[PDB]
Design an enzyme around this catalytic site. Structure first.
Site: not given
Ligand code: HEA
Ligand code: HEA
Ligand SMILES: [Cu+2]
Ligand SMILES: [O-]
Ligand SMILES: CCCCCCCCCCO[C@@H]1O[C@H](CO)[C@@H](O[C@H]2O[C@H](CO)[C@@H](O)[C@H](O)[C@H]2O)[C@H](O)[C@H]1O
Ligand SMILES: CCCCCCCCCCO[C@@H]1O[C@H](CO)[C@@H](O[C@H]2O[C@H](CO)[C@@H](O)[C@H](O)[C@H]2O)[C@H](O)[C@H]1O
Ligand SMILES: CCCCCCCCCCO[C@@H]1O[C@H](CO)[C@@H](O[C@H]2O[C@H](CO)[C@@H](O)[C@H](O)[C@H]2O)[C@H](O)[C@H]1O
Ligand SMILES: CCCCCCCCCCO[C@@H]1O[C@H](CO)[C@@H](O[C@H]2O[C@H](CO)[C@@H](O)[C@H](O)[C@H]2O)[C@H](O)[C@H]1O
Ligand SMILES: CCCCCCCCCCO[C@@H]1O[C@H](CO)[C@@H](O[C@H]2O[C@H](CO)[C@@H](O)[C@H](O)[C@H]2O)[C@H](O)[C@H]1O
Ligand SMILES: CCCCCCCCCCO[C@@H]1O[C@H](CO)[C@@H](O[C@H]2O[C@H](CO)[C@@H](O)[C@H](O)[C@H]2O)[C@H](O)[C@H]1O
Ligand SMILES: CCCCCCCCCCCCC
Ligand SMILES: CCCCCCCCCCCCC
Ligand SMILES: CCCCCCCCCCCCC
Ligand SMILES: CCCCCCCCCCCCC
Ligand SMILES: CCCCCCCCCCCCC
Ligand SMILES: CCCCCCCCCCCCC
Ligand SMILES: CCCCCCCCCCCCC
Ligand SMILES: CCCCCCCCCCCCC
Ligand SMILES: CCCCCCCCCCCCC
Ligand SMILES: CCCCCCCCCCCCC
Ligand SMILES: CCCCCCCCCCCCC
Ligand SMILES: [Ca+2]
Ligand SMILES: [Cu+2]
Ligand SMILES: [Cu+2]
Ligand SMILES: [Mg+2]
Lengths: 259, 539
Positions: B90, B120, B160, B188-189, B272, B274, B276, B287, B321-322, B347, B350, B469
């Site tokens: 997944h 193109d 993952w 690819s990327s 990280h 990744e 963004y 936008s 922070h991870h 952020t 925006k 988890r």
């Molecule tokens: C779309 C993907 C995406 C994005 C955009 C972000 C955005 C951010 N992530 Fe997240 N993150 C993930 C996907 C993402 N993350 C994933 C997949 C993991 C798990 C990896 C794994 O272990 O598998 C993870 C895990 C993760 C961790 C590790 C947690 C842990 O494993 O214990 C942390 C730690 O700080 C973190 C922080 C943040 C922060 C600060 C932002 C910031 O970029 C967000 C900023 C946005 C806002 C804050 C909201 C809008 C702002 C305002 C309204 C302004 C006013 C707000 C304030 C003054 C607070 N994230």
């Molecule tokens: C894009 C990122 C993404 C998305 C969309 C999802 C979608 C969902 N995820 Fe997932 N999730 C991850 C990224 C994502 N996950 C990652 C990285 C992990 C970590 C694995 C690990 O621990 O190693 C995780 C782990 C994770 C867990 C924790 C597993 C564990 O720790 O044991 C769970 C538990 O319920 C979960 C549930 C779901 C569910 C119910 C949905 C969905 O069913 C929610 C409903 C959403 C939809 C129905 C729409 C989905 C649409 C698209 C994806 C777009 C398709 C593209 C086009 C249409 C062009 N996910």
């Molecule tokens: Cu991060």
């Molecule tokens: O992240």
């Protein structure tokens, strides 16, 4: 008997109870941050809902053309900065308190294995392993059964503690500084107890430290917190916090008298 | 004249490659979403009822069908490896083979050249190769699931992010296949990124100055730079895993003098950026969409550009922070915490700018706008829990729990994905020549909104209560919110199947588009001056 304190409760939405000064600081800090982030979220949500209600096309048929407002654009950069600085101000002291290891009253060395924990008390020359009640080591296969339930009851638990309870516990005295040194034997595991506010990865080749001082007696559970293979879900942690006297009693029970 | 394979898969045109990335991303999306339904079937109730070791003795097919019906606990020997494999599958599918191919490879390839007035991409054959490397990578990721893996079963149950020594000790070769898949995704990327950058810089239309380039094309431009720095670093990390596994090195093996935590630093240096890379193209789409349906130009165009640039750069200096519980010094923890907190500032600029764009507008609540508005609210919910997590003192408790899972699904599945749907509904008329039925777009939106919130919001509760988890099973006290979460997942899945029905209907029976711009004059970028669909050769 001992009260079961460090455990999840049905339908729970908050933290597990605190049993250490560190856990209490986490609860306070998270409560502080939660109020702030809820305020922010509610603010953003209300602004969106208002804008939609106010400037919906049936109400406002003629759109404006502005793309700037300096006073506002400055305010919405500066205010988030202030809030973040405020959070940091309270967050750093908590972090420092967590991570500065005080002098140990009790020292325990913990090793993570696939799939169980080993405990050593180097001051006491005690060493033992701790398996989930229900694990293959205890005759089970990681599921509830009439034997597992009987085993849980004999050990002072109930079927409700299944997946949390281990055959042996890490026993410590109340109100004493415990320093735990954590390492892994094979892959990375992670040792944690939510009630104490502690968590430290158990990395092969590294010995990491954490500390806690438990503030009440009872039973506190954690669960392995770094995926480590097939039985990641099935190698929990039990800490029993007891009187100084009950702690000595448990130490003596482990003392070998060879002549 | 041209057969189906030649017309599509052999095409070097950006619009055709874009469409290929979109459909493929959608298909892999469906597969990965199906995994989550099964995941949530098992998490619906404490005790293991579906993932029984007993199902291994049957065939692959009959074992599959047996797996779908619940067993009594006393007839079901828990199989944690299947859980671990599903979870890993997944996550790898989503992170490498779904959302970025859809946003960057799909809408990026399709619209970026249109937005800058380029006929193109700079290297059209390279662009076609990028797609094939993507499919080859997907095929290998999928193949890893049926290849000899951990615990004498099939598949990699390693997460993952492939942490060693677990990933370097997993038996079989399933893990090596997953590593190759990720290499092919990376390539690819990178090829995509080389094209985006060269095209954006060298092939803008006469008069198209950098400060007149539309925001989506900026978002794609910034994303491509991140890819160029992030993905080669990952290729290193995973090549080291491959050599520890197969070629006698000991990079991460302490017996040979290695350090497992070194892998984590290298991995998260990619890991990280990744995220963004995932969300920036979605910022771009939001936008364009908000400006169109508020009938008002984007508020603060330049801050919008510079905010994405700042986010991209900051995304490279926050990786640990991870790693707060992995043995970081107090100094490292303090720095990474404070660095991470800074990201909220650009952020927030925006988020506030999008609201200011709506402010004083004439707001039309069409389906694409519903998705964008949902994004604002839901991405904010996910962003603020990210800030919570950046606090290492609080992360001590939350790390490796479902609070993290709640965080990342709000920003990804209720954020980036809402961006994908926003773009699909915004642009399907333009790409296909046929329009979607409005009522069905709206039903899709609301089903997904309710369903995804029910799925993920309760995970915050589970995390606060300390649910870890990557667990096949959990203590009984976690039953209530796991059950709610699962119901949300099932409703969400229904909405997705409905969506796929909406697309099928649209592309076969949808009302024909009769205008170059079927929205309004505030859809004011170049694709709206072209026909629907645009001609084979544009500009
Ligand atoms: C779309 C993907 C995406 C994005 C955009 C972000 C955005 C951010 N992530 Fe997240 N993150 C993930 C996907 C993402 N993350 C994933 C997949 C993991 C798990 C990896 C794994 O272990 O598998 C993870 C895990 C993760 C961790 C590790 C947690 C842990 O494993 O214990 C942390 C730690 O700080 C973190 C922080 C943040 C922060 C600060 C932002 C910031 O970029 C967000 C900023 C946005 C806002 C804050 C909201 C809008 C702002 C305002 C309204 C302004 C006013 C707000 C304030 C003054 C607070 N994230
Ligand atoms: C894009 C990122 C993404 C998305 C969309 C999802 C979608 C969902 N995820 Fe997932 N999730 C991850 C990224 C994502 N996950 C990652 C990285 C992990 C970590 C694995 C690990 O621990 O190693 C995780 C782990 C994770 C867990 C924790 C597993 C564990 O720790 O044991 C769970 C538990 O319920 C979960 C549930 C779901 C569910 C119910 C949905 C969905 O069913 C929610 C409903 C959403 C939809 C129905 C729409 C989905 C649409 C698209 C994806 C777009 C398709 C593209 C086009 C249409 C062009 N996910
Ligand atoms: Cu991060
Ligand atoms: O992240
Ligand atoms: O900046 C840092 O801020 C910390 C603020 O937390 C200080 O920690 C100081 O204050 C903490 C209070 O919790 C103590 O735990 C530390 O020992 C003490 O060094 C520390 O000196 C200072 O450089
Ligand atoms: C007084 C009359 C005496 C007559 C005695 C002879 C009848 C014995 C039949 C027992 O019933 C069985 O129960 C199983 C367990 O419920 C079922 O397994 C099915 O359901 C299980 C659910 O626990 C799954 O685990 C199994 O894999 C799946 O094959 C099985 O089909 C069913 O026949
Ligand atoms: C449009 C997409 C739709 C997605 C498909 C949704 C599938 C959901 C059906 C799941 O079936 C349920 O599974 C539970 C197990 O999780 C069973 O719990 C019951 O039975 C178990 C024994 O199998 C016991 O262990 C439990 O405690 C007890 O509550 C319950 O009976 C059964 O109906
Ligand atoms: C923190 C809040 C973030 C949400 C943003 C919503 C508020 C936006 C209001 C914009 O203010 C506008 O500024 C224009 C030029 O200055 C004015 O034209 C004169 C106009 O009348 C005024 O309304
Ligand atoms: C489930 C995935 C969702 C993806 C939705 C993407 C929809 C894009 C469809 C574009 O397909 C178009 O089909 C037309 C004939 O029908 C062609 O003439 C046109 O050239 C082609 O581009
Ligand atoms: O249930 C569908 O409900 C829709 C109503 O919400 C119906 O659309 C009906 O009503 C729509 C307007 O709401 C029209 O656009 C459609 O032509 C008409 O079939 C449909 O058929 O199934
Ligand atoms: C005592 C704690 C009860 C409150 C539970 C609410 C926590 C949910 C956090 C989610 C953050 C949403 C912005
Ligand atoms: C003006 C900047 C907005 C920052 C959010 C604070 C919420 C106020 C209640
Ligand atoms: C001593 C307070 C330090 C707070 C720093 C927070 C950084 C916010 C950006
Ligand atoms: C081999 C177990 C079946 C998994 C079902 C996926 C949907
Ligand atoms: C007594 C068994 C009832 C279980 C019914 C649920 C099975 C449906 C799952 C298929 C998807
Ligand atoms: C290697 C110990 C795992 C416990 C048994 C799992 C059963 C799957 C067959
Ligand atoms: C002592 C702070 C660590 C330096 C990392 C910057 C990137
Ligand atoms: C009659 C339709 C009303 C739509 C309300 C818009 C809100 C949707 C986005 C969630 C925030
Ligand atoms: C206790 C409130 C439940 C929240 C439901 C998720 C949306
Ligand atoms: C808590 C015991 C009730 C079990 C009901 C399971 C049925 C769920 C319906 C799936 C849709
Ligand atoms: C305005 C014409 C209505 C046509 C309905 C199209 C919706 C398709 C639903 C497909 C559901 C598949 C499960
Ligand atoms: Ca279950
Ligand atoms: Cu473990
Ligand atoms: Cu583990
Ligand atoms: Mg971890």
């Amino acid at each position: 008997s001992l009260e079961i304190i460090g455990r999840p409760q049905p339908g729970g939405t908050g933290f597990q109870p605190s049993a250490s000064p560190v856990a209490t600081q986490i609860h306070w800090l998270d409560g502080f941050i939660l109020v702030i982030i809820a305020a922010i979220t509610i603010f953003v949500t209300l602004l969106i809902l208002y804008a939609v209600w106010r400037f919906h096309e049936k109400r406002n048929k003629v759109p404006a053309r502005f793309t700037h407002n300096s006073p506002l654009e400055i305010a919405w950069t500066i205010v988030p900065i202030v809030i973040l600085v405020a959070i940091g101000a309270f967050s750093l002291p908590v972090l420092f308190n967590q991570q500065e290891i005080p002098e140990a009253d009790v020292t325990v060395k913990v090793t993570g294995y696939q799939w169980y924990w080993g405990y050593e008390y180097p001051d006491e020359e005690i060493s033992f392993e701790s398996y989930m009640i229900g694990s293959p080591a205890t005759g089970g296969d990681n599921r509830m059964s009439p034997e597992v339930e009987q085993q849980l009851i004999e050990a002072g638990y109930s079927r409700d503690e299944f997946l949390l309870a281990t055959d042996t516990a890490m026993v410590v005295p109340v109100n004493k500084t415990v320093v735990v040194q954590v390492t892994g034997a094979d892959v990375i595991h992670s040792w944690t107890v939510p009630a104490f506010g502690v968590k430290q990865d158990a990395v092969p080749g590294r010995l990491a430290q954490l500390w806690f001082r438990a503030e009440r007696e009872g039973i506190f559970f954690g669960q392995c917190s770094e995926l480590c293979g097939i039985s990641h879900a099935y190698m929990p942690i039990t800490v029993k916090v007891v009187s100084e006297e009950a702690y000595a009693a448990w130490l003596e029970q482990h003392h070998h008298h060879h002549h | 004249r041209r057969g189906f394979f030649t017309r599509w898969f052999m095409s070097t045109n950006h619009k055709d490659i874009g469409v290929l990335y979109l459909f493929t991303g959608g298909l892999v999306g469906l597969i990965s979403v199906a995994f989550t339904v099964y995941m949530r079937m098992e998490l619906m109730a404490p005790g293991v009822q579906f993932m029984c070791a007993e199902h291994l003795e049957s065939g692959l097919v009959k074992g599959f069908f047996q797996s779908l019906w619940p067993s009594a606990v006393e007839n079901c020997t828990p199989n944690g490896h299947l859980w671990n494999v599903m979870i890993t599958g997944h996550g790898i599918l989503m992170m490498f083979f779904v959302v970025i191919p859809a946003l960057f490879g799909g809408f990026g390839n399709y619209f970026m050249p249109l937005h800058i007035g380029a006929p193109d991409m700079a290297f059209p054959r390279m662009n076609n190769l990028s797609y094939w490397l993507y499919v080859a990578g997907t095929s290998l990721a999928v193949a890893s699931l049926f290849a000899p893996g951990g615990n004498g079963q099939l598949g990699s149950g390693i997460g993952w992010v492939l942490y060693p020594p677990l990933s370097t000790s997993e038996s079989g070769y399933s893990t090596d296949l997953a590593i190759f898949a990720v290499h092919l995704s990376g390539a690819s990327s990178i090829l995509g990124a080389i094209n985006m950058i060269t095209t954006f810089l060298n092939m803008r239309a006469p008069g198209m100055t950098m400060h007149k380039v539309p925001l989506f094309a900026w978002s794609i431009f910034v994303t491509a730079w991140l890819i160029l720095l992030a993905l080669p670093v990952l290729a290193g990390a995973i090549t080291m895993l491959l050599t520890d596994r197969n070629f006698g090195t000991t990079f991460f093996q302490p017996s040979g003098g290695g350090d497992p935590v070194l892998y984590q630093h290298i991995l998260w240096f990619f890991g990280h950026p990744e995220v963004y890379i995932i969300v920036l193209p979605a910022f771009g789409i939001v936008s364009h969409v908000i400006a169109t349906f508020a009938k008002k130009p984007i508020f603060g165009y330049l801050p919008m550009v510079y905010a994405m640039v700042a986010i991209g750069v900051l995304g490279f200096v926050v990786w640990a922070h991870h790693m707060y519980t992995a043995g970081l010094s107090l100094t490292q923890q303090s720095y990474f915490m404070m660095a991470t907190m800074v990201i909220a500032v650009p952020t927030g600029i925006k988020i506030f700018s999008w609201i200011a764009t709506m402010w004083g507008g004439s707001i039309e609540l069409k389906t694409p706008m519903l998705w964008a508005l949902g994004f604002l609210f839901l991405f904010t919910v996910g962003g603020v829990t990210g800030i919570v997590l950046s606090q290492a003192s609080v992360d001590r408790y939350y790390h490796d729990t479902y609070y993290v899972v709640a965080h990342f699904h709000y920003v990804m599945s209720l954020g980036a994905v809402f961006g994908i749907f926003a773009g699909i509904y915004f642009w399907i008329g333009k790409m296909s020549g046929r329009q979607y039925p409005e009522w069905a777009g709206k039903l899709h939106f609301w089903m997904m909104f309710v369903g995804a919130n029910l799925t993920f919001f309760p995970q915050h509760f589970l995390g606060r209560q300390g649910m870890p988890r990557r667990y096949i099973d959990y203590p009984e006290a976690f039953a209530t919110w796991n059950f709610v979460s699962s119901l949300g997942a099932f409703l969400s899945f229904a909405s997705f199947l409905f969506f796929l029905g909406v697309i099928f209907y649209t592309l076969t029976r949808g009302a024909r588009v009769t205008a170059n711009n079927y929205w309004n004059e505030h859809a004011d970028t170049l694709e709206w001056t072209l026909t629907s669909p645009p001609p084979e050769h544009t500009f």
